[PDB]
Design an enzyme around this catalytic site. Structure first.
Site, PDB file in Angstrom:
ATOM      1  CG  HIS A 152      -1.802  -1.208   1.298  1.00 25.56           C
ATOM      2  ND1 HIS A 152      -2.778  -1.495   0.372  1.00 25.56           N
ATOM      3  CD2 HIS A 152      -1.851  -2.184   2.225  1.00 25.56           C
ATOM      4  CE1 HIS A 152      -3.390  -2.608   0.722  1.00 25.56           C
ATOM      5  NE2 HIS A 152      -2.829  -3.064   1.824  1.00 25.56           N
ATOM      6  CG  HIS A 167       2.560   5.753   6.125  1.00 30.13           C
ATOM      7  ND1 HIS A 167       2.181   5.534   7.427  1.00 30.13           N
ATOM      8  CD2 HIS A 167       1.518   6.390   5.536  1.00 30.13           C
ATOM      9  CE1 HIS A 167       0.967   6.038   7.609  1.00 30.13           C
ATOM     10  NE2 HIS A 167       0.563   6.590   6.487  1.00 30.13           N
ATOM     11  CG  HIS A 197      -1.008   8.439   2.049  1.00 23.90           C
ATOM     12  ND1 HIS A 197      -1.771   7.299   2.014  1.00 23.90           N
ATOM     13  CD2 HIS A 197      -0.728   8.649   3.357  1.00 23.90           C
ATOM     14  CE1 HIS A 197      -1.950   6.857   3.255  1.00 23.90           C
ATOM     15  NE2 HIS A 197      -1.311   7.654   4.096  1.00 23.90           N
ATOM     16  CD  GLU A 215      -4.314   9.436   2.833  1.00 20.60           C
ATOM     17  OE1 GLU A 215      -4.022   9.405   4.037  1.00 20.60           O
ATOM     18  OE2 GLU A 215      -4.804   8.450   2.213  1.00 20.60           O
ATOM     19  CG  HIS A 243      -0.065  10.299   7.214  1.00 17.62           C
ATOM     20  ND1 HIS A 243      -1.019   9.600   6.508  1.00 17.62           N
ATOM     21  CD2 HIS A 243      -0.360  11.609   7.072  1.00 17.62           C
ATOM     22  CE1 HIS A 243      -1.839  10.453   5.944  1.00 17.62           C
ATOM     23  NE2 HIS A 243      -1.475  11.677   6.282  1.00 17.62           N
ATOM     24  CB  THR A 268      -6.271   7.975   5.691  1.00 18.68           C
ATOM     25  OG1 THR A 268      -4.955   7.440   5.519  1.00 18.68           O
ATOM     26  CG2 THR A 268      -6.260   9.257   6.453  1.00 18.68           C
TER      27      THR A 268
HETATM   28  C1  LIG Z   1      -1.708   0.534   4.954  1.00 17.97           C
HETATM   29  C2  LIG Z   1      -1.257   0.356   6.413  1.00 17.97           C
HETATM   30  N1  LIG Z   1      -1.667   1.495   7.244  1.00 17.97           N
HETATM   31  C3  LIG Z   1      -0.940   1.871   8.298  1.00 17.97           C
HETATM   32  O1  LIG Z   1       0.136   1.268   8.586  1.00 17.97           O
HETATM   33  C4  LIG Z   1      -1.426   3.011   9.140  1.00 17.97           C
HETATM   34  C5  LIG Z   1      -1.435   2.867  10.512  1.00 17.97           C
HETATM   35  C6  LIG Z   1      -1.875   3.914  11.310  1.00 17.97           C
HETATM   36  C7  LIG Z   1      -2.309   5.108  10.741  1.00 17.97           C
HETATM   37 CL1  LIG Z   1      -2.851   6.391  11.775  1.00 17.97          CL
HETATM   38  C8  LIG Z   1      -2.310   5.310   9.347  1.00 17.97           C
HETATM   39  S1  LIG Z   1      -2.745   6.834   8.587  1.00 17.97           S
HETATM   40  N2  LIG Z   1      -2.623   6.663   7.027  1.00 17.97           N
HETATM   41  O2  LIG Z   1      -4.083   7.125   9.012  1.00 17.97           O
HETATM   42  O3  LIG Z   1      -1.699   7.696   9.078  1.00 17.97           O
HETATM   43  C9  LIG Z   1      -1.875   4.205   8.562  1.00 17.97           C
HETATM   44  C10 LIG Z   1      -1.758  -0.978   6.912  1.00 17.97           C
HETATM   45  C11 LIG Z   1      -0.903  -2.096   7.008  1.00 17.97           C
HETATM   46  C12 LIG Z   1      -1.356  -3.334   7.465  1.00 17.97           C
HETATM   47  C13 LIG Z   1      -2.691  -3.500   7.846  1.00 17.97           C
HETATM   48  C14 LIG Z   1      -3.558  -2.406   7.750  1.00 17.97           C
HETATM   49  C15 LIG Z   1      -3.077  -1.156   7.286  1.00 17.97           C
HETATM   50  O4  LIG Z   1      -3.948  -0.089   7.181  1.00 17.97           O
HETATM   51 ZN   LIG Z   2      -1.192   7.591   6.135  1.00 15.00          ZN
END
Ligand SMILES: C[C@@H](NC(=O)c1ccc(Cl)c(S(N)(=O)=O)c1)c1ccccc1O
Ligand SMILES: [Zn+2]
Ligand SMILES: C[C@H](NC(=O)c1ccc(Cl)c(S(N)(=O)=O)c1)c1ccccc1O
Length: 258
Positions: A62, A92, A94, A104, A117, A196
């Site tokens: 992703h 990470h 986006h 985002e 993020h 997100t």
């Molecule tokens: C894609 C990746 N997401 C995260 O690691 C992620 C974790 C915390 C936050 Cl707060 C965010 S965010 N984008 O809101 O900052 C993104 C993921 C990997 C494995 C399983 C589910 C998953 O969603």
């Molecule tokens: Zn993110």
């Protein structure tokens, strides 16, 4: 047929596996700068990254995550709108297929080329998996990227990407210092929201910095050479891994600055 960012598995489909997608505090949102209220009660953000122990970088299919040792109070976020101490677990990005999209959050409908993020969990819940079950479990520091001059502090990340081109690849990534990704100003907007990405849990205090960082076109081009696919599968570049803005509903965005 798991979730992703495509026509048949992208953001408009996520609600079928993750009904909270249509919830009351979803992220990201458009930040209407004229409607955001200056809140003189908000504190300066405290970003204490001097002891951050980066460990590894992972292409998770992703995006990619730069992971941290979160087993001690070593890289923590506090102050701002937060109560207590939040520990850095990973960062990470986006990003888009073109410089005109990728973020985002949006600012008066403006899309940035990318968004960083930095994900932190509230130490009162003991670790990340427990924190995500709580409405004040996470704090994410969001930072916009625009294309212009290079960000020297980003280059060590860019140069390792060749080694995690594909899903499931990781590389040792030690002594990386996330202070090199911040901008001058810690002026921010803040609101209550969600992850997100699936599972879209409504556990995040968002802290979005007003000042973008600049990265070079060459740097973001290297992001766009990544692969969503695993090795030995048909190539699908890594691009447009952003969720669009969601309804604000019954929320207020607060500004730390006038
Ligand atoms: C894609 C990746 N997401 C995260 O690691 C992620 C974790 C915390 C936050 Cl707060 C965010 S965010 N984008 O809101 O900052 C993104 C993921 C990997 C494995 C399983 C589910 C998953 O969603
Ligand atoms: Zn993110
Ligand atoms: C371009 C990159 N530079 C830095 O990480 C870097 C070096 C000195 C400084 Cl001062 C910084 S800074 N000011 O952004 O925090 C950053 C780099 C430096 C050495 C080896 C490989 C690299 O990719």
């Amino acid at each position: 047929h798991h979730w992703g960012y495509g026509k048949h598995n992208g953001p408009e489909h996520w609600h079928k596996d993750f009904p909270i997608a249509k919830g009351e505090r979803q992220s990201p949102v458009d930040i209407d700068t004229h409607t955001a209220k200056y809140d003189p009660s908000l504190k300066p953000l405290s970003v204490s990254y001097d002891q951050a122990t980066s460990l590894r970088i992972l292409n998770n299919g992703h995006a990619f995550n730069v992971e941290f040792d979160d087993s001690q109070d070593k890289a923590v976020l506090k102050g701002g709108p937060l109560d207590g101490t939040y520990r850095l677990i990973q960062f990470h990005f986006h990003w888009g297929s073109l410089d005109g999209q990728g973020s985002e959050h949006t600012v008066d409908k403006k899309k940035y080329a990318a968004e960083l993020h930095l994900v932190h969990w509230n130490t009162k819940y003991g670790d990340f998996g427990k924190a995500v079950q709580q409405p004040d479990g996470l704090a994410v520091l969001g930072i916009f990227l625009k294309v212009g001059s290079a960000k020297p502090g980003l280059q060590k990340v860019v140069d390792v990407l060749d080694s995690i081109k594909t899903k499931g690849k990781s590389a040792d990534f030690t002594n990386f210092d996330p202070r090199g990704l911040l901008p001058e100003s810690l002026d921010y907007w803040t609101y209550p929201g969600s992850l997100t990405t699936p599972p879209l849990l409504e556990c995040v205090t968002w802290i979005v910095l007003k000042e973008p960082i600049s990265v070079s076109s060459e740097q973001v081009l290297k992001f766009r050479k990544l692969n969503f696919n695993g090795e030995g599968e048909p190539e699908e570049l890594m691009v447009d891994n952003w969720r669009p803005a969601q309804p604000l509903k019954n929320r207020q965005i607060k500004a730390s600055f006038k």
